[PDB]
Amino acid sequence: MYRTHYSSEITEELNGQKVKVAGWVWEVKDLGGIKFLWIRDRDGIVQITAPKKKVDPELFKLIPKLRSEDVVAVEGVVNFTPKAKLGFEILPEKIVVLNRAETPLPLDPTGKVKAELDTRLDNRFMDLRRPEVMAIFKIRSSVFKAVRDFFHENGFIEIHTPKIIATATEGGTELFPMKYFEEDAFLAQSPQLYKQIMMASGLDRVYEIAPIFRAEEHNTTRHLNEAWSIDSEMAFIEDEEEVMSFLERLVAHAINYVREHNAKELDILNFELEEPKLPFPRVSYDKALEILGDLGKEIPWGEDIDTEGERLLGKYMMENENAPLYFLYQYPSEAKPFYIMKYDNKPEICRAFDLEYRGVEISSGGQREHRHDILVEQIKEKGLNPESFEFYLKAFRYGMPPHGGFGLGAERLIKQMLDLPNIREVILFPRDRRRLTP
Amino acid sequence: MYRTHYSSEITEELNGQKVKVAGWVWEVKDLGGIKFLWIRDRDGIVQITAPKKKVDPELFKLIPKLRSEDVVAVEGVVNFTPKAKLGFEILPEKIVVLNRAETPLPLDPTGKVKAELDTRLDNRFMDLRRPEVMAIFKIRSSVFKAVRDFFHENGFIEIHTPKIIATATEGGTELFPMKYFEEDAFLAQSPQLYKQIMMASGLDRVYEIAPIFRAEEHNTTRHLNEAWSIDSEMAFIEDEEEVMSFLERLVAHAINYVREHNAKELDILNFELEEPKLPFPRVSYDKALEILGDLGKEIPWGEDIDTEGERLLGKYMMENENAPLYFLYQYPSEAKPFYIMKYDNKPEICRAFDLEYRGVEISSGGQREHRHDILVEQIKEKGLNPESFEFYLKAFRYGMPPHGGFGLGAERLIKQMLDLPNIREVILFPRDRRRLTP
């Protein structure tokens, strides 16, 4: 390897020791009698100082030749001194140029000049060179890790369902049609039916983090045509609250993991991420509708709360409860999928819920209807053909325990967590109605 | 929750205490003076003994009404005794029938009547009720966990790249052509181009575990049209040996994790997973070609070691090296992709390698060509148009460090690890040249 340490792995213990660092030429200062070379790492910058009398002559004249963004490797002795802004500096013994960079650069990694989102997405390799952009994806990676950690600690098994499907769905479109040889298939937009089917196998507590595909005809700052969903399903529950409680702690765990580990990244982003306050308030759909109506947002009882409503409720919740996260639940049965269980005592409302982070929905789920006949009837009620769902309904005929689950949008989770404006900021290669490359 | 403990988490420490178990009715012994109920968990069987003189009458009457595969929940008192073949038993206080099963069952959970693989695949929810099937799936999840842990322990950041691409990266068919609105795209077979672009971003060490799609016209027991790949790319390497060494340790780590944590699963499979002995032997393509020569298999230099050649080689390596895992490297450049770096000293040979597990390739990688001009030349050498790779090549122009990586087949790694005869055994819903549903 061209390096032994990252800018962050160098500490006191190494003082006076030879190390090897590598990165991109950040800055060069030829001040005559002494030169300075700053190298950029994924963790930060490293100062290489070259006092004319302490360094090799060939090396002294090489430094001023280095250009911005050149990939170089430096071997030298670590020197802890108060003169170095970062605590220590490297006294170079050897400097190798691994690769020279062309000019001009597609983006300004220095940050002076801002560039359109489109330009940045077209040059992601350049864009990530900026600390605040790198910070996001380090945080994205941390979130996935925390989420998976929490699942494991709670006895969840990771499962993987098919992305190429030919089976029915309650939706219909926003499905990317595809050709499977002679047959016609589509890309799956949710593991919903498959994860439920697995509740009849005894796996009990399952989860999957995989990409889902939706061919939405219009672009929004909230969703993309390709996303990473964090689905989960758990059997032997008594009510949707068990699922809500779990999700709640999952989310709190990922948020707190980011606060602990990515404190540096959060600072870089100039963002103060709140300590989760469990339990998050539950706001029934009827209470939400009352609240909204008083704000002039009139939603007829029965239709779902729109984008403007979620936005208003998010604000209301924040001012009246200092709640960046809250649940909306007990939705009207007509407003939810055929597989959501209804309140046997109040059949017009169902056991479905949505988790709102900063006024935007990051997850939805609820207790499922595991009773075959009731499920069959609810399909019919939705005006669908139960015969189109045989592969699915068959699983509810041979001992199907009570169950519930959720779907967590990974990008949406991160975007709302960091309070980012556009969702294209949390995914490296966004897939738009207008974007297919790179 | 309807259950507090799985059969596996009931120990001495709980004797005399009230607990809650739940699962599928496995067996009932209707004896008149006493009743016995066995329940199946994802982890095993639990014996519930109900002596007439000790249980509630209604409870007594209920048990004999229970039928196979019915979902039941039981609250009772733990009782450790030699009289129980399993160590303890539960003295029922409450029994609830959560859901009843229909007869006949799609498959036989007792394992009496064997079913052909297609039947099992059509009824995966039934199939996992057999311990030998559940074992494979628990091990699969462990492998994924082990792999991610190793990656993180080694400074890798998880990234996620596009599954819908227009970008014809190293090709021919075996691609699933798609329609991205007006545009026509393809389902990615590898994150190759994208993981290399990220190498110029400074992330340095990345990995991705995601679905990959390949339209192979012919069915085999070693591959499917949809799979999960473990991709990784690391920068600042000096040769493909650094990558091989990492892959090696990653695989060993995954194998040892299954050995520690799924010891029980392996027993059910009556399989002895060997302890990884690093470093795995590295057989050059030329030497492999010579070994096969002794074995009577003549493969003209330049050509690929076919299925029988792989089989003979892995057998030789196992018997003559006690090596179930070994590398094959220094392949003919002509036989490898345009992004692989050739030996500047011996251009006819390149820095590519393959990992063979029990004689089947489970992974391939190598050091890439990070030099823009040479790379463009190699794209031309392959009969491809460099201008179709603009977004890709662009990343090699503003400081691209030396780098290399690999692609590790998830299903292939698990299939070979457990010495399973068919790759369909290690994935829930297999996508064949003939399987599209469920």
Q: What is the separation of C-alpha A25 from the centre of its chain, rounded to a whole number of angstroms?
A: 30
CA dihedral B421, B425, B427, B433 (to 10 degrees): 70
- Establish if A183 touches chain B: CB-CB under 8 angstroms: yes
Q: Which helix (H) or strand (E) holds B252?
A: helix B240-261
Chain B residues with beta carbon closer than 8 angstroms to that of A194: 428-429, 438
In single-letter form, the type of residue at position B305 comes to I
Which residue is closest to A242 within chain B, CA to CA? B1
In angstroms and rounded to an integer, the radius of gyration of the C-alpha atoms of chain B is: 27
Q: Do A164 and B226 touch (CB under 8 A)?
A: yes
- Residue of chain A whose Cα is closest to the Cα of B23: A202
Instruction: Catalogue all structural domains in chain A, each as residue range(s) with its CATH number.
Output: 1-105 (2.40.50.140), 106-438 (3.30.930.10)
Please give the residue of chain A at the shortest CA–CA distance from B4.
Answer: A236
- Tallying the residues shown for chain A, one arrives at 438
Catalytic, A183? Answer no
Spatial neighbors of B373 by CB under 8 A, at least 6 apart, are none
Note the resolution in Å, 1 decimal.
2.4
CA-based nearest residue to A256, from A142, A356, A358: A142
Residues of chain A in contact with residue B433, where contact means CB-CB under 8 angstroms, are 181
**Helix or strand (DSSP H, E) at A77:** strand A71-80
Q: Check CB contact of B69 with chain A, cutoff 8 Å.
A: yes
**A355: closest CA among A324, A316, A334?**
A324
Query: Dihedral sign, CA of A220, A221, A222, A224?
Result: positive
Q: Which chain B residue has its CA at the smallest distance from A224's CA? A: B162
DSSP secondary structure code for residue B399 in this structure: -
Cβ proximity of A123 and A430 under 8 Å: no
Chain B residues touching residue A399 (CB < 8 angstroms)? 24-25, 69-71, 99-101
Confirm or reject contact between A162 and chain B (CB < 8 A): yes
Q: Do B144 and A158 touch, CB atoms closer than 8 A?
A: yes
User: From which experimental method does this structure derive?
Assistant: X-ray
- A390 has a chain B CB within 8 A of its CB: no
* B86 has a chain A CB within 8 A of its CB: no
Give the nearest chain A residue to B70 (CA atoms).
Answer: A399
Does the active-site annotation cover B364? yes
The verdict on a CB contact (< 8 Å) between A128 and B198 is: yes
Residue B273 gets the label, from left (phi > 0), alpha (psi -120 to 50) or beta, of beta
Optimal mutation site among B46, B182, B241, B398, interface A, most CBs of chain A within 10 A: B398
Question: How many CB atoms neighbour CB A218 within 10 A?
Answer: 7
> At how many degrees (to 10) do helices A285-294 and A307-321 cross?
90
CA–CA min distance B291, chain A (Å): 33
For chains A and B, CB pairs below 8 A equal 259
Residues at the binding site of A for L-aspartate are 170, 214, 364, 368
- B205-213/B157-158 β-pairing: parallel
> A129 vs B176: CB contact, 8 Å cut-off?
no
Instruction: Tell me which amino acid residue A418 is.
Output: L
In eight-state DSSP terms, residue A85 is T
Q: Three-state SS for B237?
A: coil
Chain B touched by A307 (CB under 8 Å): no
Q: To 10 degrees, what angle do helices B131-153 and B240-261 make?
A: 140
Enumerate the residues of chain A whose CB falls inside 8 A of the CB of residue B42.
202-204
Q: How far is A296 from chain B (nearest CA, A)?
A: 38
Chain A CB contacts of B179 under 8 Å are: 176-178
| Of A331, A315, A398, residue with least CA distance to A364 | A331
Alpha-carbon span B437 to B153, nearest angstrom:
39
Name residues 95-124 of chain A within 8 A of B (Cβ).
98-102, 105-106, 122-124
Contact assessment for residue B349 and residue B309, using Cβ atoms and an 8 Å cutoff: no
Contacts of B239 (CB under 8 A, 6+ apart): B351, B367
Q: Does B65 touch chain A (CB under 8 A)?
A: no
Q: Are B410 and B351 in contact (CB under 8 A)?
A: no
Rounded alpha-carbon distances, angstroms, from residue A227 to A224, A230, B161, B225: 6, 10, 10, 21
Q: How would you classify the pairing of strands B226-235 and B164-165?
A: unpaired
Q: CB B181 to CB A228 under 8 A?
A: no
DSSP line for A351-375: SEEEEEETTEEEEEEEEB---HHHH
List, in sequence order, every residue forming a beta bridge with B363; answer none if it has no partner.
B355, B408
